[PDB]
């Protein structure tokens, strides 16, 4: 088989027109038709374009495809915050049976302001120190954009060691939201005088301490 | 209103195998055709495999030789994919796509079904221990730690469901040892920490492990 090539993402305010590019590296890729994907994250693929520039029922006329010399091309006029979605081109190689899928892209409509993140620490429960376990919680949550990293100090010097971090998650009200575990051992806690999440998001960090009580 | 109804969530260890159903709900098989679709978590679309009931043809992409058999049953409608020797690869959503119009052109998928998640981990069931995030016009933050738990998903209540307001469950975090953790925290008012008391209820179906944990101030 051979490949389709998308751009990585594509980003909008709304209103705005963005397009989005699909190159495929086979021979016969100028005449071959194309077929357009948008993806809501959490849910199934659903069609948007076939054969090049068709469209469904119910897909809206916002979207339209094209085809400019051995490439093809997605455009979304006046965008929506609800076209956030990854967006995948897609060939069909009659001599393979194969369907080929591009990398897909993801759309980002600009706009929503920026949020920091709050941050919430929770020491190891006396309940947990008495299993002979210990974890420490950090909590973030209500930032804008869906991106942060997380740093742990043990009195002021970086760990690493024990660190689980989660992805980004989109929160209900549209704002992001993330957790950072600190696996460590009772006589770690007692042995260190307090831990530090750090949370750094858009140039800020913003931190938060715990010690042993 | 046609549509692809699939089969659920499926839990499998390394190298075994595991079979996923796709039923036409609205129509028949006529000339259409049926793909299986499957996406890594935070990966892209990656075709699988087709079939063409009506001659019988069955094809899926290279990567698979040897590993996917589609077969196809004409009197309940219904498409099955099966995938064996499995591995870590392997976990992904998967879905059923229609595939034609109804004289059998066309090669865009048009029906998809919701999917169908398939985890495939060496891990064995384990149900989670329950501790609790003791707090310490401010507000107080409260919380349960549900740690070591597998399979996903738990569910996490307050007061039975009494208490809905302030409660953000995050999303769970895979650990090295397979299995996952999660926290539910609940803001309130701090004045009425000493009003009323606070019970988490977790359950974890995947090992019908039902624990009520009460959080109490330091």
């Known amino acids: 088989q051979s490949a389709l090539t998308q751009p990585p993402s594509v980003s909008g305010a709304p209103g705005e027109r963005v397009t989005i590019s699909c190159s495929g590296s086979?021979?016969?890729?100028?005449?071959?038709?194309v077929y357009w994907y948008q993806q809501v994250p959490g849910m199934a693929p659903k069609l948007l374009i076939y054969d090049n520039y068709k469209r469904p029922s119910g897909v809206s006329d916002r979207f339209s495809g094209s085809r400019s010399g051995t490439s093809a091309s997605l455009t979304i006029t006046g965008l929506q915050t609800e076209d956030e979605s990854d967006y995948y081109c897609q060939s069909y190689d009659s001599s393979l049976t194969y369907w080929v899928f591009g990398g897909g892209t993801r759309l980002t409509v600009l706009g929503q302001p920026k949020a920091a993140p709050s941050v919430t620490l929770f020491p190891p429960s006396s309940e947990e120190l008495q299993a002979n376990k210990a974890t420490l919680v950090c909590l973030i949550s209500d930032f804008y954009p869906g991106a942060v990293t997380v740093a742990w100090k043990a009195d002021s010097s970086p760990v690493k060691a024990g660190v689980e971090t989660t992805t980004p998650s989109k929160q209900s009200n549209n704002k992001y939201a993330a957790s950072s575990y600190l696996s460590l051992t009772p006589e770690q806690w007692k042995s260190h005088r307090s831990y530090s999440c750090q949370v750094t998001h858009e140039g800020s960090t913003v931190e938060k301490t715990v010690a042993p009580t | 209103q046609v549509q692809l109804v699939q089969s659920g969530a499926e839990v499998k260890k390394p190298g075994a195998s595991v079979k996923v159903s796709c039923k036409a709900s609205?129509?028949?098989?006529?000339?259409?055709?049926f793909t299986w679709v499957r996406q890594a978590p935070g990966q892209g679309l990656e075709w699988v495999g087709v079939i063409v009931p009506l001659v019988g043809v069955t094809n899926s992409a290279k990567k698979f030789q040897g590993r996917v058999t589609i077969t196809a049953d004409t009197s309940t409608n219904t498409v099955y994919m099966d995938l064996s020797s499995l591995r870590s690869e392997d976990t992904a959503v998967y879905y059923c796509?229609?595939?034609?119009?109804?004289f059998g052109s066309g090669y865009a998928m048009d029906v998809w079904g919701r999917g169908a998640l398939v985890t495939v981990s060496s891990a064995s069931t384990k149900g989670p221990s329950v501790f609790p995030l003791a707090p310490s016009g401010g507000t107080a933050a409260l919380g349960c730690l549900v740690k070591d738990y597998f399979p996903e998903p738990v569910t996490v209540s307050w007061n039975s469901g009494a208490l809905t307001s302030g409660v953000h469950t995050f999303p769970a975090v895979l650990q090295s040892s397979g299995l996952y953790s999660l926290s539910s925290v609940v803001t309130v008012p701090s004045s009425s920490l000493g009003t009323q008391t606070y019970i988490c209820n977790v359950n974890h179906k995947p090992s019908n492990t039902k624990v009520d944990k009460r959080v109490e101030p330091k």
């Open positions: 796509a229609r595939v034609g119009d109804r």
């Open positions: 086979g021979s016969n890729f100028e005449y071959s038709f």
């Open positions: 609205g129509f028949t098989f006529g000339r259409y055709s």
